Structures are given as structure tokens and as C-alpha cells.
Amino acid sequence: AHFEYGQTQKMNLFQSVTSALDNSLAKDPTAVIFGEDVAFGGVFRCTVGLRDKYGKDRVFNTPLCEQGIVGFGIGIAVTGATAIAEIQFADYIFPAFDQIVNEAAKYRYRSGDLFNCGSLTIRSPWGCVGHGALYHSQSPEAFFAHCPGIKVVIPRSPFQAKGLLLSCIEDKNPCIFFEPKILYRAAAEEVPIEPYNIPLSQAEVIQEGSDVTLVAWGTQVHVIREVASMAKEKLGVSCEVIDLRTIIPWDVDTICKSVIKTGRLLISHEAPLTGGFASEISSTVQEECFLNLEAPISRVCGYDTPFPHIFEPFYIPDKWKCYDALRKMINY
């Protein structure tokens, strides 16, 4: 491999998603969950047990048609009912791109708030998985970041996923929630059994530091956490490690406060460099923190290619690529 709320149980990230979805359907009688193969529990087990517990009218399979899944979910949401759609892999969200960008995101604005689809959430497995190649590995968040009117949220762990997913389900705006699939059965951690929320549009500083700010999201947060340890041990460099969590609208303030303190920023993501979301963060930090920058802002990202099968170990922005970029930046 490359990497206070009442009673808790150890849960992995798939189980935390099921727990959020169960909590949601228990407390919101309007809520339904649908998509390809969700009825028997889903191809990643995220919906196991839910049809039996809540009913076939509430957890159900659709035909194999992503533009239809999203259009259908928007329509449920237009009536005010909570619609939690699944897209089986994020790589297959593109058929629904028109329904998400031209319809869901613009629904409230274009009607003057006469109609909306706020009660829609789209959840989808995301990110690399060791061998997923072109169509089981993608990280599409930058495509969606250029669309005003949708929120895009990516957790780093089981505790984070349940609280962020509950926030998306209850937020009054259409949300895309990307679940890093390489974490679904990775290590468990303690997760509250009852519902709780983690705010959207709020980054989390998970380790304080004074020399350099590192920003990432999803599995890549664990990579940068390890890079921070490498930099401390090998270079005596103190890294502030930040999980962005929400891609849009993003927490500009937390990131800029950190970079004003440290004077250095490295942003990392699995998605390709060009047009990737690191570009938005870099250009914004530059505008707001210009006088504080000791070295150019570094982006350590996937290469500008499709995501390869046999070459995945060479493609990803792993801890050595991040560390090497950090070393150069520290010495700039």
C-alpha cells in the first residue's frame, strides 16, 4: 500500500457510510437511496442491510443509466424529499455531467428560488485503488469545482466520512460526496453510532507546524501526514498538515491563515496537475498571501495522462514525490 458524541464502535469507511445512511433513513421519512446494485448492499457493501430494514420502496435499484439516476434524483428533490443517489464509480459520473452542471447546480438560481434540488446528494467511490486503471481510479473533483451551485466533499477517514456525509444529506444544496474507495476496508476507527455532523466548507488542521503548510484531501491526507514525519526526522522541518475536506465552496481562510504563518505551501492531489484543484488553491493563496511567500507554491499531482494500469506505482504523487518537492521548496 502507498499510504463526546456518545457510544462509538470501530468502523471502516464502508461501514461508516452505511451508518450515516441508516441514521438518515431513520430520522428522515422522506429519504430514499437508489442507483445501480444498491438493493443487495452495493458493490462496495455501503448499503448492506438497508433495504431489509427500511423497505424496497426506499432502497432500490435503478436501470443502468447514470444520466437517468441523477435526473431522477433531482426530480425527487424538487418535491422536497431527500434523494441519496449512488454513482457506482466516480469514473462513470460523466454521463450525468449535464444533469449535474446544467440542471442540479442551476436549479435554485434560475428559478428565483421557486424550485430547488437542495435535498439531493450524489455519493460515489473515488480515487486510486492500486490497479483500477483508467476507469476505476479517477478523481473528478476539479471538473465539478468550476460549477457554481454544487458542493463537492471528500473525507479522509471513517469518522470524517460519516459526519461529512450526514452534513451533505442535510445541506440545502445539491452535494457530491466522493468516498475514497481504497479506504473502504482499510483500518477501522471509532465512529459514533448516533448521528453527528462535521461542517462543510471547513478545512481541518490535523497537525500544527511552523515551516511549511501541506494541503491535501481524501487518502492523500495520509500521504502528506507521513511526509510531515519524514520532513521532521530528515530535515528538522515543522509541517502544518491540513485536510481541505470541502472542494467547493472551499475554506480559503484556514488555508491563508496557515500560509501567512509558515510562508510556504505544498498542495498535493491524485488528480492530474493541469486544471486540477491545486491550481485554484495556489492562485488564491498567491493573491492573498503574496507578501508572505518565501518560495513558490508547489503542486505535487498526478501526471497529465489517463490513469494507467501497470504503471500506477509510478503515476501517483506518493510520499517520496511529495517529500522531494518539499525538500526543494525548503531550499529554494
Place this chain on the structure above:
Amino acid sequence: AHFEYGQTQKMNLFQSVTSALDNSLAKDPTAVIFGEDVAFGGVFRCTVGLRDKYGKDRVFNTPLCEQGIVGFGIGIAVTGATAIAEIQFADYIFPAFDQIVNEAAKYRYRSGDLFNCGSLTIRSPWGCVGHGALYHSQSPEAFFAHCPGIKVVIPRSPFQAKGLLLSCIEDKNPCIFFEPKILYRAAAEEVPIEPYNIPLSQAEVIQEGSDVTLVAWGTQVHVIREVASMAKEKLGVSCEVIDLRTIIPWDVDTICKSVIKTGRLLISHEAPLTGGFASEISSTVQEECFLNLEAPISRVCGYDTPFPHIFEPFYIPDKWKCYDALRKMINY
């Protein structure tokens, strides 16, 4: 309103597109043109006369289905024949986003060059038009810029459009060519009647200057040209004005050479700020020209909203918004 090659004739931008398409079908017997309403000449007149001249098997209407238009064009191109697809407004390219991003862009890579769709070009009207509102005004280039394997090209004038469109048609990669529709019937200029090519991935410095670099594309080039004149007259500031022309792969070298000379950069585009392509240019110039930057790189873009009907005069990054940003940057 907000804004050597043999014989030439005055042509507006729609006529220059027809001239490129006519030149293409005369010299390439494989070439066909298709899409909604192209047979009678197109809703913007870009294909007038071509079905009569070249035949109904070569210039023809499809059913009203953008995912089909693009899939169909990829298939023509898989056989080696030149396929010039039209998408009626760029706002309606999203149904075809999967066929463009998951299929066209990845076709050559994923087959090890056993198959390709290089002979595909997709052309589409683009950009604001005074009253187009949400779905007749969009500028989608940043969505496509995050997809390795496609080229995205945007001309500023009739002469530029014919030469860039011929280059896209003949380039061995799938190309999206966005035609700024507010220019279709704006002023003519002299355009060679016979074919000629303007290179892709090459910016053009259309006015040399020493104090600040301005970068834009499409109609917005004329806006920044006027801003340069305003800055000269009102501030005695010398602006270098650059038309980017190709969004991806983009001419990093020409832009960085300019900013190393001037020390200042302002990039402007109609598309919304967040995730817009100015973000990629800014973050790259920052990395390459860090030591030369006298002031933060400025982005003057559309606001992060859908594109409004009655409010369009207030939405666009017009010459006053660009000038005001430039003034602040000069005084930083």
C-alpha cells in the same frame, strides 16, 4: 457592445468558418460535417452552401442528441475519416462530456495507439452574446482543460479562426474548437480564400509592452487590447497583450517569457473565477517566474454564478473591471 497567403476577401467570423470548412472538404475526400440543423446552413450560418456543393452524404443533419453526435464522430474518426461535428451551443456540450472525456481523449492512449480518433474536430459557438442567459452564453473551456488527450482552441478573429480551425481539422488529436458567437457577424477582416494554418499550442503577442502582461482569449482579447490603450493614456503604463489561442496544451513558454520581462500579469476570461483556466496559468507562472513577480498575479473573471439574463452588463469582466484591477496591481 462591450468590445502573404494569396488573395483575401473581407469575411466575418461565420464566413471564415465556412471558408475553412469548404477548403477542408475540397482537399480531403474523407471529410464530413454533421450535427443539428447543419444541412440548411446552421443556426449561425456557418455551413451555408456546403451541402449543395459537396453532397448530402457529406454535410448532414443528425438526430437531436449530443452524446450521439460525439460518439458517432469518434466512430467515423476510428476509421481514419475526418469528422467535423457541430454542437449547436457550447452550453449543450455537456451531454457529450462522457464521450469526450472518457472516450475521445483516452482513445489513443488506452489502445497503445492501435486505434485513435485524431481525425475528429468538435466545433461549437461559445461565449457571451448580450442576452444569452444561462444556456446561450457559457464558456466551458476549463472543464475540458483538466482532460489529458484533447486539445481546446479558441480564436479571436476571422483570420485567426480560419487558420486555427484548419489546424484543428488536420491535427492528429481530437480537438474542440470554440467559436465566439458574438463575433460571428461583428466586423469583417481580410481572410485568405485558400487554406493556411496557424499553429496550435502557440500564444500570440499582439502588442509588445514592458510594464504588465495581459492574457486573454476569444472576444476578451479585444477587451484587454482596449485596457492596454486605457492604461497607456491614463496611467502611462505599457502593456504587453497576449492572445493565448490554445487552452490545452497551452503555450507556457510565451507567457512566462513575457512575465519575466514585465514582472506583472493580469489574466482575464468570461468564465467564472473558481476553477477557471486563469487559475492554471496563474499557478504555473508563479512557479516559473516567482523571483520576477512585482505584484500578485490578478485574475479578472466572471463571478461564480450561472450566467444571468438581465444582469449580463454587470456580470462580465469588462474593460472597466480589467482596468481597475490593473490600476491596483500597478500600485501594489
Place this chain on the structure above:
Amino acid sequence: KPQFPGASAEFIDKLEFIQPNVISGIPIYRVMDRQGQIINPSEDPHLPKEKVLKLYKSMTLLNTMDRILYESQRQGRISFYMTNYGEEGTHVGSAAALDNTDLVFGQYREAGVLMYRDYPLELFMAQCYGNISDLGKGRQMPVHYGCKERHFVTISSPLATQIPQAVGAAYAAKRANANRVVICYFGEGAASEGDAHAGFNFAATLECPIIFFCRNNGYAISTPTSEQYRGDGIAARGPGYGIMSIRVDGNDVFAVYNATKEARRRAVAENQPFLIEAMTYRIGHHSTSDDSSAYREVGYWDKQDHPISRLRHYLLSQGWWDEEQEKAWRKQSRRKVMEAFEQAERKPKPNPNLLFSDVYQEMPAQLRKQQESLARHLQTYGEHYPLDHFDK
């Protein structure tokens, strides 16, 4: 004897391809002829006089409004318009068969549904002018109507997107025990989009109380139906999805009414979709951006087979109308439309701050920063902006 799960069928021991029946397709249901005469008494719905006069007055008031707003567009008074000529029967015949609270999703050439639901002239005008009275806050192109009170979901330009959305609203209605039906209108061109295949199939497999209502008016902009499809129109597609389907004479307000009334009754009782294809002819240009004489018979339709004329003949039979009433109503309609038109033109546009709200339910702080940046901008450079007919 075959056991395959994917179909229920017998074996056949001879190779025979199934041929589509396109030359004699699904027949066109008619109730009255072109002279307004009832053809088959057992099919006459015998609607009461006041309702049939409402059908007639709604169509003609829409036609009056269309003529005025088409001319306003030609003068540059509004930026865009699209008429309903030749298709007023499909609008009003189907609306009259719905419950007031049945939810409608449309395409853009549906305004008669709103007119039948008593949508004020002032609000049609307000949306076309983008003025302060527009509840859509002037953000969409003209003719992109919506009304929450009258259960008419805001129109959007992208064709066919509303089809799978209507299906989802119908599923939610079913769960809510709403006893409500959703109707979704679209044209035969839009039916070529992938979202129509999505919506048609989802409505059948998920058992949704929805009426799909396709207006087949022979053209999608310049594209005749011979280049749009090669099956027997849209009606013949329904049964392939398991959808009960019918084709009607769209210029016959009673045939449209009867079919929508029966589809509504059965869709709400049975939780199953129905498809109605109404055959008609697009008499007007596609829109103010189209000169239809570039690609096409119009006068045949306008003079020989029009929904308004056909219903006028029927009224003139029952003795429910005459020339004097016709002239007085033509005068009164024109006056009502002109009163709304004058008012609409003299209203200011909304405050330019409204370009930033409703992107999300709550304006993100970064979006509020952009709002503030426009306010600062206008303080310095406001002379260069058309500030004088915008509110505040």
C-alpha cells in the same frame, strides 16, 4: 418452453426478422372533424359550456399575447420569444384534464398550460422583460416560465433534461400517497436525447404515475422528422418500454382532453406511466432567431387545420358563440394584453445584487466578497453601467 429470464416468449423454428409498421402506424385518435363536428357520439366528453369557453378563451388569449410579444421582440423590446401557433390545442386540452395540483414539467412551448391555470399576464410579461415583478429575478432567457403556486416547474433550455426529473417527482408523489400525477411535455426532437430513454425506462421499472406528452409538430428547428427518426414516431417507442401509449390529433382539443383525462385516471390508480403523442404542426417559426422560410405547407395548416378554428366551429354549433362575441373577445383580450404589456415595460429591472443570490441557498462568504466587489466597482465606475432602469 424457453427458460431465459430476460423475456417471456415461445420458441420459433423459422428465421423471421420483425419488421417495423411505419407506413400504417399507430392511428390518430380524433373526436371532432375539421368542421368541429363530433364524429363518434360515444366519445364526446360533453364538457359543460363554461369549461369549453375557457378552453377557447385560453387559446385565443395566448394567441393574442404571442402576436404582441413576437412583435415586441422584432422591435428589440425583449431579447427573445417563441410562439405557440398551431399547438394551443395540445396545451389547453391537456391542462383541462389535469387536477390543479398535478405537477407540470415542460420544454418551452407549453405556455397555454399556464394560461389555462390562470397565470397572470403581468407575470408572463415580467419574465420576458426580466423586470422587478419576475419571481425568477430576471435571470433566465424570455419564455423560461415557472410558477410554484400553479405547480409548473421552471423551464430550462437544455432539451429533455426534465424528462427523468419528472419521473423522480412522480416516484416521490407515489411514496407521499399524493394521489397526484406528474405530466411532462417535450417535443419530438427532444425525444431523441438520451435523457428521454432514461426517463421512459425509469418510469416503467419504478412504476411511476406520470404522463409523458410529446408534441410532434414535424420539425425540430430546421430538421424534419424524416431526419429525426425512422420508426413510427414517438408513440411506437412507448410499448418497447412497457408504457401504455396513444397517438392523438393535437389540433382536436377534445381528443387531447379525452386521452389526457384517461391517462391521468389510470396513471394515478395504477402507478404506471402513459405516453401520449399529439400530432400537430408548428405554424410559427421556431423562435425569433429563426426564419423558417429558409427550410420549408404552413398555410395549409393555418387555414385548413388549426385548433382555434376547429373549436370555434364547435362553439358556433352548440350556439355557444357567434361573430359578435368573437369581436368583443378579440377587443377585450387585446386590451388586457396591452395593459399588461405597458405595465411590464415601465417596471424597473431588479437590483443587480440579485445576480449573486440563490446560487446556493446561502451565499458563500467568497461569493459575498464578489458581490461587495461589484458594489465598490459601481461606486467608482457606475456612470458606465445602465444603472437607471435597475432597482436601487
Place this chain on the structure above:
Amino acid sequence: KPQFPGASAEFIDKLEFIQPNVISGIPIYRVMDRQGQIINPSEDPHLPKEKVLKLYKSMTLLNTMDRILYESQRQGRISFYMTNYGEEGTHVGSAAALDNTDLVFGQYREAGVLMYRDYPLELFMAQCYGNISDLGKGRQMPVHYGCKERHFVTISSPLATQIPQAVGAAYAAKRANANRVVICYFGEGAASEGDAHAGFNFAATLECPIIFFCRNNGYAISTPTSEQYRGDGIAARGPGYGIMSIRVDGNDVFAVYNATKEARRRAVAENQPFLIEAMTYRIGHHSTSDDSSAYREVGYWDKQDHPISRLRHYLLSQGWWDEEQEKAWRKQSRRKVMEAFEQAERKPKPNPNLLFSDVYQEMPAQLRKQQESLARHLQTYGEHYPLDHFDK
């Protein structure tokens, strides 16, 4: 008497919805029974012995390869696999009816078409291992085969995308006076995607020489057909688009062959599309990522109605096969597959530089800069990368 441009039909004076015929759907064409006996002599294609033995040997060699590669996946030797069990008849019966140069687009559960076209075992292996012999340069998931020499377009994961592409290739063939047909395979699940509605309609309106070949195996992963559609399978959709359509017994290699042979002849002569729905049953799991016992009868199919068994009975009739030949071929196949398997496992992977080429035809300078950055990276940190079984 109706005049509407959008359809050709008579009037009807009574309201009647059209009911879909799903209980007795389009019948299933059969040539031989489950005992390999010819049912109707006039339908027997009387293929010569050497060709029928090729049908049989291609199916069983695919089955041998599937068993081996499924086990290799279970051991972690390859990352993914998907078997063809129960569907080998549809593959090989249809391939045998095509010209060698007819172009094929597939879905992923088509490998028998390549096996019939003599695709080397070494190349199936090379793609699953992503080794240096893979012409796909190890870039795609296993089972994403492609061969330019054998006119089999590289498979891609996104379902149904190849359907409108196949139509475009068929249009280009028509223009080139190729006298070639394109065939496009997909499953009944993929048929729900919008791109199937696109391709079906474009092939009809643009008059393209294409065979659409749907394998209806009762499931799309966990989803049974009762949740996939409610019409009479996929065959009943064809006529709605104007497409000649037929349904066949997919476990009958002769019925599949006869239907594809006739569709090919007519599609190439007439420039019109044909649709074949082959009914079959997915005997194996969906893929190595699926444990199908979580949602489902399999042994009925495997023991009572299998394409390999059915054809074996036919051979055993003509006296063209026997138990001794069966054992010797089982041994020889296993040996050939194991020889290719051993070779494939011992080949190195391609040079990691190959992750950068073919993104565009020419590597952009900025992409070459990223290549150089990886080369520098590996010079310093190479001990941390699995460099030892990669070329160069």
C-alpha cells in the same frame, strides 16, 4: 387522411391505448434442441465439418483459458478477470458469420470473437498481465482487449459508449464503399444507457450497415431484468427505431450463426441496421470482484442448457467427435493455455516511460517535462519502486 408530417397513419374514432405484448413476446429462434438435434431441416445451415469443429474448439479453448485466468486472479497473479461462461455460443456463432474484415466493437464479455479470429493466447495473456508483449502497453485493466489486425476495437470500461461509435464507423464504411459491416456487442444492462438510444436512432436515420448484438443474460451484476426494463426485452425496442429485429437462442450456435449471417447480408446490401437479441444466461459471477451467490438456478443452466454441451451433442451425432477426441483436445488445450500462461508470467512489464506516450499522438513539451521529472525521481528514489520487473 391525416396529414401530419411526423407519422403515417389512419384516424381512429375510439380511444384505445396500445398495450405492450410482454407475456408472449417476440419468439426465440432455435435451430437445434438441447440434445443437439436439428428441429427444422430447412433452417439447418449445413456448415462443413472443419468449420463446426472450429466453433467447438474455439468455445472450449476459451473455456479452458477462462478457468485458468479466473484462478490466476484468485491467487493475485493478475488484478482482475471476467469469464465468458454460458455465453461462448453467442461469441463464436456470430463471429463465424462475419467477414474477417468486418469491424467489431464490444463491451468486455466478447473474447470468443477474438478467439475465433485466431487471436494468440500469448496476447490475451499479455493484456491481462500488462507485460511487454501487450500492444496496449499495459495501460488498461485486464480483459480490455483490442487488435487492429483482427479489426476488434479496443474495449473500454464505460458501458454502451461503443454503440454510437460503431454507428459512425458503419457510416464511414458505407461512404468508403467498403462492402463491410460493423457489429457492436453489448449487454442488456448497457442497453439502458442513453448512448444505446443514440446509436439505435442514428443508425436508422443515417442508414448504416451495422448489426447491434445484445447479449441478454438475465443480470447486470446483481440487477435482474425485472429491475432493468419492463418492455419485452431489447428486441422489442428495435422496431420503434425502424430497425429490423430478431431474438435468438444464444445457447444455440446455429441459430446465432443463421441470424448474424442473414443480418450481415442484408445490412451490407441495404445499408440498414439490424438488431439481434441473443437470450442466454450468465453462468459465472459478474467478475472476480463479484460473489454472485449474494443475489441468486445457475446449475439448471450449466447442466441443462449450455452452448458447449449442445454443440458437443450435435458433433457426436454427425459422428464428427467422440470421447477420445474430447479427452485429447481437453489435454492439448490445457497444455497450450498453460504454455502461454507461463510465458506471460515471466515477461517483464513495459518501460515506465510508456505511461507518458500516446496521450496525444506527439508528447507535448510539458508532458515530456513530467516524463523527465519521473526519470530524475527514479534516479534518486528508485530503491522505493518495483523497478525490477519493469523493462529498461
